[PDB]
Every structure is written in structure tokens, then in C-alpha cells.
């Protein structure tokens, strides 16, 4: 999987590839209807790496809360994820610090963030990428980020394309979203 | 064991 | 085992081989009366790979619920399976995420689905196959899917035949079912 | 051990060898009084492979129930065995799915069945055999099953004799039983 | 593989299955032209189990000798095989006693023999079988050997059929040969 | 890699994918000029699976012989390969029977053949495939082989396409060759 | 290390980073005078990854030959490297196919090539990169390759910069060379 | 990480690098907004080494207490940390004496202190450093500590710079803080 | 051990600690008469880390050559060391590339060099250090190198002192030498 | 660590070194303010070896009791330590008999004692030493104990000095205490 | 074993204990006639630790040379030992640098020396000790070396006594020798 | 440790050595005041082998009972010890049958007994010994038991002396006790 | 161990 | 590894 | 596994 | 390790 | 792991 | 680990 | 094993 996130010129974008792997087996978007790796949670988008099951777990989990959570600051995202982890263990059969076994990027109008598997929450200032395709994506976005003809969404998508070009765990098409940075 |  | 599932021209079909293995021992349908690997659950068909015991476990489990479950959307299948897993552990002596140790395909008139052992639920758009015979079946169905003289059930069965031709864990006859896609 | 079961021309038969092993040590029926590996449970006969202790455990267990169980359909045998397993663990010190560590064949007038160690219950249509002598028995019964001069019991016993001829875990005499198939 | 050999009523017969395995992959006689596992060496027939490469190695090796070897007594077969082993190591890249990694049956008019992988040479008095299917075959031939309507070749073939019926490393058709016992 | 070989209606064809892997890295034919996995050796074609280095080794090795070898019968191919193996060890730094670490298909007008890594040489009667994509290719060719509108080369190429569709070690374009069967 | 190589618009370029690592220790170009990872061999440039010792070994080895070698075709480079390997073992204390433990890119006017540690020689058609920084570089060059304002050398260098931006085994400055493609 | 702490001429200073590592991946302060490794807790500063998640855990934990803790003597720091450890286990999913898996330096006006991962609390008299860059920092501060033109903060920062110069787990910019020693 | 080497303002200096370790045992210069870790070889000084035996081996080896070797360029030092290695193996009982198990710094008027255990030869432009005390020494010299009152020898020695201050494998006194850089 | 204890001519003395280790890292008394390894508990002195954390744990633990404990007979010290051990496990996160992981010497006017990590309590009659430096200390005190010019405290200190002279886990200065033996 | 060596006031002495161990078994000088661990070689005394067999090997080896060797400088002792090692391997069945598996002290009028198992040769300036009792001996000699009433031999012997007092691999009586330092 | 027990001519005696070991370290009775390994419990004497801590545990434990236990028959000693074991686990931190990790001899006027670590209680008829010195002691007592000039106590002590003579875990002086056999 |  |  |  |  |  |  |  490759997932990317970019913040540039008053816009925020998030993108992902659409290939599912089962061993060396490829399950492309052409065979799997529910191939999207980005879910909506409130006005945030959450792009997910890891076991494909986590897409459905997070959807179910966030759905079950009284209201959706605020995912717009590092401390907030941290609490949400610390609680989540307990729930992964108590309800969803997950097995130094324990791992939640997924890395996610989170985009909303207030900022771009990431949560890694040991609940390290980071806020990013320009772009980043998670997933095994991530270094190909980082290189591509490093080359394109200051291109004045490429908006945040073009850059995000370019990251994913680069990873799908060279790495066997990423595949086109690219799914992506874009929003205005809030003031 | 299906992965993203 | 090979199990297959196909959706084509308004019809949905599901198929399975009939061979049971015990080591290198073969228990063909000619020696085993209860050789069917597909069960009915409500108006769904469920084709099972894994230990032969799971056929009976699912039959007993689903029979024991107040009414049979809706297995017609990804989110629904997920809940059913997440509950099921708990029951496999509490009542049926099952041992990153825990594994349910079975992969199944699910056909009903509202769609074709799969659930893999770590509860990854997928909806399929044309065809798919699970089981050790699965890649032989995928190739065969890839070659035959657009043949205009082969309906969904022919394609499903052809998948199983291909696997039985070349792999020592699949065997003829093929058991299959077909239904109309709903509107 | 070899145990066999046959269904032919309106009769059902079950057979077993009588040799007990302790390592390479042989405890033949000539030295062990209670050498029978088939027990009666209701109007069913149950032939046991595995630790010799299971003969006694099943006898004690089934004796302790309110009435003996119905063992005349695949689903029924499955429930009986799933419960039994829990008892092996709670009362009798047994240690993907957990194993009950025994394979048994079950004969009664309504049919011939088998339960393998992971509770796979099968109904057989002609003959089968469990135990380490089992392939020798299968071959012999394959050759003899359609012989018109050999009734179900002859075929069952022949299976055991073949195993005792060639394999060091099976030994003569053969113990066997025969009954009429019900209408 | 299953290979069998029988000596009965002044005739000698030898048989083999025709299935080649590559993992769980099946390469049946229908796909492989050179599927025969018995080769001719002088007036002897040699049925081979083990790596498929040994068919060709023996053919090449025996071809390369001044004349073909006498394979008609236990001591003779032993010398032939002890020499052969050295040649497997010096010319053909083979790796308590060292193993030649193949078991063979040898039929000629002077008798029926076997050589196992550690150069144990045996002469058989009625019938025998080598290969992973061997116990199924031994049981079937035990049941059929004294049938007065089944000649040596029928019995040999029946052995192979039994193995192909129940074991995943043997497959039909059966290749067989028959000859008169000499005086 | 997937390589395939087919013989049908007086023509013989051989095919291969063009993707090179370095870990999970993909080196497609679009980045690598010398991406062909089939080489010419006399009037034979040799399609190679295994380390990419073997393409060049064989080319160098066969080039160095007095004339190119006859590869048109099973025994002949065997000799060629037994000698070759020694050379892989003495000149090219290769490390039950030793392995040559490559599986190849060989096509010429006199027939279609394969050599697996332990020098098992087979002649094929309809089609076959080697490489990690091989079972997908076998299934696809099984489904298409009797299609009257698909010649040998179409079937060969279809095999490779199927594998590239579903497996992460195969990639398009397909390289293929065709010849007329000789009389 | 990151090394890159590019061929674009009639020019060929090659580049490398300049950081040496000893564990987590960094030896930057600011402390090490002989920090160049590209050497000249005839009119070729050879960029080296692996142990730093190989820079000096190749320089010594190629220096010792009667004349420098032709490194302008895949077959040629292969021979040169097959011989080299023997020399690494016999004179320079190096320890399926054996590994030469270095990956190198080779640029000259006749083409751009790579040799990986198991002597896989590739000719590249647009760009490539070796070394642990290689995927970052590949992404960057994928994004910049078709930029009409960036010549082959800019692209090569951009690759290395991307790797030094994100990976702890690469470091600026970048060393690079450029030449005209010959006609 | 490198963190340093210094006490000199009536001032106390504390410093840290800003580089985050994910494997060999570098996440510099230029990409990560929340790159600070020092947090404020009452009038103390706490510089943290270990998993990046601990920055957020401590911030959350200390925030949750009735008031912030006194961290101005060895015994006090010890109690705070012994309680903290229990909380890392009960609320934050941490796994001779157990380890808290983090080493920290603590600066306040009443002194300079450290707590290592097995809750060894030390008070320092001149300077110290924790983290994998620590020995480079110790050497640099040893050389500079008595320089009369370098105040406590210059020395602290020099320590971090030295580590970033030579070690791949530390990176500029340096974040630092300074306070007056109390009377 | 710590050894250091510095080049500054037309002078070159080299230094070493004097402590020998045997386990946790310390053998200081006060108990060992021959505690010097630097030897003279021609007009070079060679400071040695590793087993204490290597001091004597190099002294004996270099003494045994026709004349002492030129150690004043990277390529030259390399040849000397590549030959040396062979001798360590053939005469002195030493056991990717093989290791010579010693790291040395080499000072002469034409430059400052290092040779690491896998014969990586480096030329240094300002200063460097080898041995377990090396990072403490690097930090100290980083802080002091541009101090205008500290000549090359002061800086070299300061490195060793820093290591002896904080690390249990280095000990005072410091032995050092200085020479003029040649023109 | 070295700790010593001596009883001679109506006086009792106890001593310790002052060096703290972190790996091969040395934290001398010159850098660590709270370097004392002896604590006061009632009118007893307790010298501690083991993890540095135990100094603080014992101080906290003994402080927390109603009154300080009597440590003046073997049976008493034993009860105190058996209770302590339980508290190390329940409050302080410690992990044939279980080990308390510390060795201590105890001096008071009624006698000199030791407690080893498995709660072996000993009373000493002349002198003893614990810690890794202990054998060096025992030898030195064996040589000096009967010197008529060396009082108990001189001997105790001499033990520590000897260890610091030759072992890398002990370091000067020596901290010591002396008291009158009671009547 | 403990062996010691001392140089003081114009005299040189060497000493050893006399206990032989076989496991936990003690073979004291009272049961073993040839219990001496010091041998004479020219005008040197050689005290040996290690296997008891080395006493005899060295005696036999040195006896076999043309004349006894000079053992009076570090370089000379080194050559003698490097040759010796080769002989241990070629004639006496011994098995980074190879180990000679013995540590020895060497006393003669020109100095006091030691050779450790990896041929590290040291010249000592006051005293030293080898063997498992060595630290006890070092401590004792540290305490006694400057005592004006104890000559070199008293100090040497005191070292051995200390070790025998406290350690189970050393035992009295002490064997010792003394000589005048030469001018 | 060696402990012995003897019953002869109307007297019973028990003996033990007095050496404590800590590794290879010896703690003789000359340094340890509380060196006695025999304790009194009622009118029984209990000699203990194993960890030194058990002396104090048993003393504390037996002291804590309402009255001391009867240790004068095999069944009685067994109950006492079975209860004891539970207490070693619940109160004293001890970790086929579980082991109590100590072997003891018990003497009283009604007989001589032993309890081994798995609670095997034996009554002895002449003499016995436990502890690592035990076989030396058994041999000595075997030789001396029928000597008419040696009473039970002489023989018991002689056993301990023999062990101290030859084994490194036993040491003089011997502690012993004697009593009259009751009538 | 019986499998599908 | 192709077997019979 | 993100480390300071 | 470059594979076909 | 800081020791005494 | 102090033994008798 | 003696080391520098």
C-alpha cells in the first residue's frame, strides 16, 4: 500500500493506491468492488495501511461512538487512538509499547497528520507517505512539491503513482480527495 | 492474510 | 479445496470441488456421502475452505441464531463474522489479528462476497476463488469470463475443474448453484 | 490399530484388530483380557483409535449421561462430539481447532459414520477405515467390496487382516459385529 | 508413485502408475508424453520410485555399460547397485550407509526382486510394492492374490489401482508388463 | 516469472513475461532494455525461470560449444543438462540430487519439453508452464486449449497474461515465439 | 549509498552520494578526502555500492589488466564480471549463485548498465538507481524524467538528493558526471 | 536521539536534537511540525529518548494529575517515576527490574537530573547526555565545559551538534532551553 | 582503546591511550612496561586497535620485509594491507570480505589515513578516531578542532582524554607524536 | 561495584567505591552528585551492589515503615529481607528461590553482616566484600588485616582501592564509615 | 591455578600454587608427586596456567630444540611463542587469532614477562598474576608491594596464598623461586 | 556440602562440613560466623544441603508452628515435608513432581532418615550421605563402618573428612552431633 | 487433520 | 523437485 | 517503530 | 537478488 | 541498565 | 547463588 | 583475550 498526504497553497489532499495483496496474489480494483483504502470519519479522511481488515474495523468502531471524534490536533488524535487500541483488543481480536498494527494518514481542513503503529502521532508540514510504497512516493513528492503547476492533489497522486510504478504492493488506479485549508 |  | 464465485449477465453462481483430504489420503465423493462444501444460510450460499469441521460448525452456529443473518453487504458480513469468531472460540474450540482459519465465499442475490481468515470481507465485481486450488481457478475464469457462450455457472465450474486437473487437493465432481441477481 | 466399517447389501458391519502397543512392545489379545477396541453405545458400535485410555473414557462418559445419545446423523454425531470434547478437557485431563486425539468409526442400523480427531464427522457410502493400518485396509476392501460372495462383515474383517499382515501396529484376532440396515 | 510386482502360476508381472508430482501439482499422463516409470534393462524391467530424474539416469547409465548387467540374483543385483551408487555420485550429482534415494522393483524371468534406497536387495516370493502408495497396493494384492481368476498381471495392476484410488501421489493409467517364469 | 509452452494444430509456441523483480521492486520492460527471458539456441527456444543471471550464463555457455546442441529428445536434453550442470559449478559459481536452480521450457520443431531444477526432463503433449505464475497459466490454458479460434501462440500468451493479471512476480508485455511442427 | 544513472536527449549521466557509514557512524565528505564512489575505468564510469573496500579493489584490479576492459554491452560486462568474481576470491579475500556483494552502475557513451551482486547485468533504457537509497531516487527520477528543463545530469543528481533527504545511509554533496551518447 | 543537560555559572540548560527516525528513514524537523523532544512539566523541562510516543504519553499523563509534580530532588523524581511506570502499564500499553523504556533528562532551577529506563535517578553536577548520540555529546561537552566564553546553553547545544555531526540517529536543528539556577 | 589522528595548520599528530584490558581487568601503564599502542614503520606512525597481539605482529611483519613500505597514499596502503592480510593468515594464525580484525590510524608527513578491519582505506581531511572510545574522541575533537590555541597534537590528545574520561576501555596516560606536514 | 566490611580491635567499618556504570560508560563521582552506595537505616549502614535503582528503593522502603528495622542478628535480617522481597515485587516492579538481585553488606555496632541475592544472610567474623570487585578486595584485606598499624576503616578502604586499581567496574573515591563495636 | 611474578629491590621472584583440579575433584600436592606448575627453560622460569598437559608439552618441546631459547625481551618471547603455537598444532594435537590456550608468566634475570593465550606478550614493571586466582593475588600484592619488610619472593608467595584462601581452584603449598636482577 | 548420618551400636550420629561456596569463591568457617549446616528441630537434628538460605527458612518455618513436628517415622516426615513445600512456595519464594530443592538428613533417637528434593523420604539402616561430597563420604563410611574402634560419630565425621579431602565444595572443620538410640 |  |  |  |  |  |  |  501507498498512502500520501500533502498540504500546499491553502489546499490539503490525501491519496492512496487501490491494490489488495494476498501473498504474491494481486486483487486489483478491477476485481474488488470495495477497494478504497480511505474512509471518511467526520470531516476527516483516514487513509489506512496494514491488514485490509482495519478499513472495516475503523468504520465499525467510529460508527459506534456517540459522535465522530475530533481528529484535528496531535493531542486529540492521540487520545482517540489510545482508546481505539483498547477496543481493538477487547472487541476486534487484535493480539516496548504494544502495536496497533496499522499506520494511517489523517487529513482534514485543520491540518495533515499521521499515526503510526505504536501510536506515534505526527503533524506534517508539507507532505508525507506511509505504507511499503512510501519511499518511492516520498522521492516523487520531494521532486514535485515546489512545482508551481501542481496543486496539492496532483502531488499526492503523483506519490502513489511512483510507488505503483516500482513496487509490487501498490497498484493503480489512485483514489484521492482534496479540501480547502481552514483559516 | 490480506493486506493494504 | 477450490471454491469459486462468479457474477455475470444478471446471474450469480458459486461452485466447489468435492474432495476431502486426510494427509495424502483422498476421500472422494464416491466414498463420502456428505461431501458438499457449500451450505445454505438464509438465501445465501456459503462455500468453505479450511478444516472440514467448519462446514458443520457454521451449520450448527447459524441454525442456533434467532433468525439467519443478513449477508448482503460488506459491513453486515463483517459484523456477522466478528461475532462468529468469538463463538468459534467460546463454543467450538478454535485456538496481528486472530485468525478464524477459514476462507469462504458467499453468494446471494444482492452480490458476491468473500471473507478471508482474518475477517477481511471483500465484495467482488466479476469472479474470484479461494482455497489452495485458487490460482488455477482464477486463470481459467480469466480466460473464460468474457466468452459469450458461458454463463456465470459454467465459468464458476470451469474454475473448479481447472484446479482439479492440476492440483492434488481438489477433486471432481463439482457441486454448484446459480441464482438471479436482484434489482 | 486398524478399524473398519462397511455397508453392503442391506447389512452394516464394523471391525477392529486387538493388538495393544506400548512403544515397540506388543500386548496381544492372548495377554490382555480387555483387548476389545469396539464399545456399544445405545444401538451403535464405536470403534476407537488412539490412546487405549479412550476406550474407557468413552464408556464412562456415555454411561454417565441421562440416556445414551443418538448417533445416527452427521449433525447429531457432531453435537455429541462437541460436548464430549469439553468433557474430555474438564473431567478426563485431555490437554487450528483443538484435537480430541482419537478417530472413531460408528456403526448403527441407520448408517455408517466416522469422527476424526478435529471433529470432522463423515457419513460413508460404502466402506472406510481409520487407524495407522488404514491404508492397507482400504486397499483390501477396495479389491473385495464388489465380490458377490463376501458380505459386509467379511469385507470389514478382511480390511483388518490386511493391515495386520503388513503393519506392526495391528494384530489378530479381529473383533467384528454385523447388523441389518434399517428401512 | 506406486510400483508393484507379482509372481503367480508361472508368470511374472510388474506395474506402475503414471502420475508425476511437482509439489501438490499434478502432471498426469495426459500432459506428459514420457510418463512411463518402468524401463527395460536387458530382459529385466525396472520400476522406479523417487525423483523423476532417476528414470533417465538409469537409462543413460545402463546404456553406457559394455553389455547390460545380469539382474537375476540377489548377489548380482547387489554388485550392480553398489557400483551404480558410485556412479550416481561421480557422474550424476547425487549428494548409517549412504542412500541412493530410489527404490526399485526388478522383474525378469528368473525372479522378482527389489532394491531399496540403502541397497537392501530382496527377492520376493509372491508380491510386493514400493512407493508411497505401497501399503494400499499391498492390501489390495493381499486380498486378490489367491483369486483363481486373476493372473499375475491383473493382481499387479490392481495394486496400483488401489493406490491411485486413495492416495494423492498415484494416478491412472497403469502401465504394466508380463512374462513367463523360466524353468 | 511465468513461462509457457504449447503444441496445437501443427504449431508450437513458447512465451514468457518480461518483468524482473528485485525484492518487491519491479523492473518492468519499460526500464530494462534486455528484458527477454527466452533465448535462441540452435533452432530451439529456451525460456528461463530463476535468477536473471541464468539468461546470460546459458547464452555464454552454449555460445562456447563447438556447435549448438541437439535439444530435440528427452535423452539428448538430459545429457546436455547433466554436462551443463558441471559447468555451472566449475565456471559460473553455482553452489537428494544437486539442483541447477532453474526451470526451463524448450521449444523446437521436433517437440516441446521442460527441464526442471533437478534435471527432470519431460516431453509435453499439449501445454505446460513453469515459474511462480505457473498455476494461473495452467488454468487459463486448460480453459482455452480446445477453443478452435485460438492457435498455439494465442494459448501460450494467454497463459502468461493470466499470471500477470493475478500474481506479483509476472508482468506484461508478453514475449512469444511460434514455429511449425516438423514432419 | 545511492547511485543513479540516466540517459536522456543524447546525454548520459551518472551520480552518487558521498557519505560513508560505519554502523550508525557518519563519515561525511567533509572528513573523508577520498569520498568519491565513482571510479573511471577506460571511458566508462563505475558507481559502486557495498563495502567501501570495493572502490579500491576494482581500481587495483582493473589497473592490473593488460588494457582496460570493454564495458559497452551486456555480454561483455558479463564476462568481465564473471572473471572479476574469481579474482575477488583468489586475490582480494571475498568469501544459489555466489554473490560478488556489490551492485554497480556503469555509464559510457555506448549505453547505461548495471551489475547486481549475483552478476545480473542489465541495460537500462531511461534511468535506474542502486543502493539502499534507491527507491527514493527512483521516485524522484520518475517525477522529473520528462521535465523538459532537466537534462540527464540534473535528473541523476536529483535522484541522489531525494535519497539523502529521507534516508540515513545517503549524504550530500552529490558527485556526478555527464557525457554525450555516441552515434 | 541526543539529549543534553548542563549546569554552569549559575545557569542551567537542556537541549535535544529534532530528528525522528523510522527505520533508516529520516523525518527531519523540516517535514514534521511537532518535532520537539523536550516537554514542559511544571517549571521543569523533560527531554525524552526512546519511542516517539513517549513525548505524548508523558504530556497526557502529567496533564491528568491534580497538579504537576515536584521534580526537584532525587527522591521525589523517584516516586513520580515509580507511579508513572504503573500507569504506563495500566493505561498506555507498555509491556531484573521492569523497564520504562525511556531515558530522560530533567532540568529545573533547583538542579539537573536524569532518569534512566530502570528508574535509576541521578543528580548531575556538571553535565550529562542520554540517547544513542550520547557519547559524542559527552566528549564535546568535556572539551568545552571549562571554556570561559561558552555558557551552559552553548555547551548543551554543542553536545547535540557533535552527535548530529557523526551519528545517524541525531539531526539538526537543536532545540534548547535555559534558566537561572535558583538561590 | 582510543586512537586519534589530526591534521591542522601544517602539522600532523597521532595519539593513543595506554590501557590494556583483560575482561573487566585493567592493566594500566603503571603495571605494563610495553603499554605503547603506536609503532613506527618507516617514517609513518601506526596506532592500533584490536587484540594487543597485533602491536607485535605488525612490528615483526614489517621488520621482516626487505625495506619498510610506503604508506603515503590510499592505493599504496591498500596493497600493503592486502598482502599483510595474507600473511596474518599464513604466518600469524588469524582465522562479505574477510576481516583483518584491527583498525589502525596511520600518520606520516604526506597525510593522515585509516585502515579499517575490512581493508577500507581512508584518507582524512581534518581528524578522526578509531577504537571503542572513538565517538567520545570525535565529539571532543569536533568541539576543539577550530580553537586557535590548540595545535594538532593538543586536539589529538584531547580526543583520547575524553574517551578515558567516560569509557571503561580507555585509560591515561596518553601517548602522542607530532610531525610537520610535507610540501 | 566493590563494597567491603571489616571488624577489628573493637571497631567496625564499611566502605564502597563511587563509580556508576552504564554499559562501558563511566559515570564517576565527579559527574554524579548522588554517587554514594551506602545508606543509613537506623543505626545500621547498608552498602549496596546491583542496579543503582536499589539505593533509592531501599531508602523509600525503609522510610515507609512504622520504625526502622532491627538489623542486628542473622534471623532478624532474614525476616526483614523476606518481607522486603515481597515488596520489591508488589510495589517496585522486580520480576531455585527467587532472586532479590542485590547483594548488600550491613554494619552496625552489634556486628557485621551480609545478604546475598537469594536471601542468604551471613554474619562475618573478620572481613568480607561483595560486588564484582570483591575478589581483589578480599586479597588486599587478607594481606592487610593483621597489620597492627591499620585500623578497621583503613582495611575496609584498602579493599575498595585494590578493586578500583584493577577492575573496570570500581572507581575512586572511596566512601567509608566507622563505629565502635558495642559491649 | 594462581601464578604470580614480582620484581622488587633488585630481585625477581615467581610463584605458583600446587593444586590440580579434575572437575570439582581436588588433586592436592599430597597425592600428586609432580604437582609443580613452574618449569625451568634455560635460565628462565615458566609458570603455567591452563590444562595440566601444557607443563609436559612445553618441557618436551623446549627440550627438543637445538639450544634453549632466549626469553628476555618482548620481541623474542613473541617469536618463540609464534613458532611454539605451530608446533602445538602440528605435533601436540591442539585444535580472531587462534588461541594457544595457556597463560604463562616468565621470570629471568633480565626481566619479568607474561604471555597470554592469544600470544600477547607483556613486560611487567612491578608485579602481575595469571590464572583464575589472579584477582585475589593482585589485590594482596597491591597491598603488600611497598611493605619494606617483604622482599620480591614474599610478595609473590603472598599473592598465591590469598588466592588459595578464597578460591577453589588454588591450593597450598606454594612453590616459588627467586633470582637477582642482572645489571 | 557433605552431610552424613550413621547408626551404630546403640548410637546415632549426624555430621556436616562447614564450607560455604559462592561460585568458585570459598567462604570458610574462619570467615563466616554462622557456618553450621545442622539445625535443631525438637529433639531432631536436620542437616541441610542446597542453597544456604534453606538453613534460615527451615529455622523460621519450624519456629512458626504451634509445636515442633514429629520427625520420627517415614510417614510423618512425609506429611511434614509436603506441607512445608506449600509454604516454601506461598511464603518463602521458591519457584514430574515439583522439587523442594534441598536434600536433608534427619537424626533423632527413634531413627535416621533422609528427605530428598522430590520428597522421597527414606529410613536408613546403617549410614548414608547427601550433598555433592556424598559419594566420597559413602566410600569412606563403607570402609570404616565395621571397624570396631570407631563409634557412630567417628564414622559420620570420617565421611565428611573424606569429601573435604577430595572435593571442592566441602571444607573442614566438621560439625557433628551424637545421641543414644531410644529403646 | 481433515481438510476441504 | 519432481517425483514419481 | 518511530524513535527519538 | 534479481529474479525472473 | 545502570549498575553499582 | 550461595550453596551448602 | 587481551585488547587495546
Numbering used by the authors:
A (entry chain F), C (entry chain E), D (entry chain D), E (entry chain A), F (entry chain G), G (entry chain F), ...: 1 to 95, 103 to 190
B (entry chain f), M (entry chain e), N (entry chain a), O (entry chain g), P (entry chain g), Q (entry chain a), ...: 2 to 5
Paper text:
The second hitherto unknown bacterial proteasome family member was primarily found in Betaproteobacteria, hence its name BPH, short for Betaproteobacterial proteasome homologue. In this study, we present the first experimental characterization of two bacterial BPH proteins. Their crystal structures reveal homo-oligomeric double-barrel complexes with internalized active sites akin to those of proteasome and HslV. Unique structural features, however, like an elongated inner pore loop with a highly acidic sequence, distinguish BPH from its relatives. Confirming an initial hypothesis, our cluster analysis shows that BPH branches off from HslV and appears to be its direct descendant.
To ascertain the functional nature of the BPH active site, we covalently modified it with the proteasome-specific inhibitor epoxomicin. This compound features an epoxyketone electrophilic trap, the warhead, which renders it highly selective toward the catalytic Thr-1 of proteasome-like proteins. Additionally, we obtained co-crystals of Td-BPH with bound epoxomicin diffracting to 2.95 Å, whose structure could be solved on the basis of the apo Td-BPH coordinates. Epoxomicin is bound in all subunits, in the same fashion as in comparable co-structures with epoxomicin, which are only available for the proteasome but not for HslV or Anbu. The peptide-like moiety lines up in the substrate binding pocket to form an additional β-strand to the S3–S4 β hairpin, as in the proteasome. In particular, the modification of Td-BPH Thr-1 by the epoxomicin warhead confirms this residue as the active nucleophile in the catalytic reaction cycle. Further, an interesting peculiarity of the inhibitor-bound structure concerns the pore loop. Although the central portion of this loop is unresolved in the ligand-free Td-BPH structure, a mostly continuous electron density is observed for the whole loop in the bound structure, allowing to approximately trace its backbone. The center portion of the loop is closed over the epoxomicin peptide-like moiety. It is therefore conceivable that the loop contributes to substrate recognition, adopting a well-defined conformation and forming specific interactions with yet to be identified native substrates.
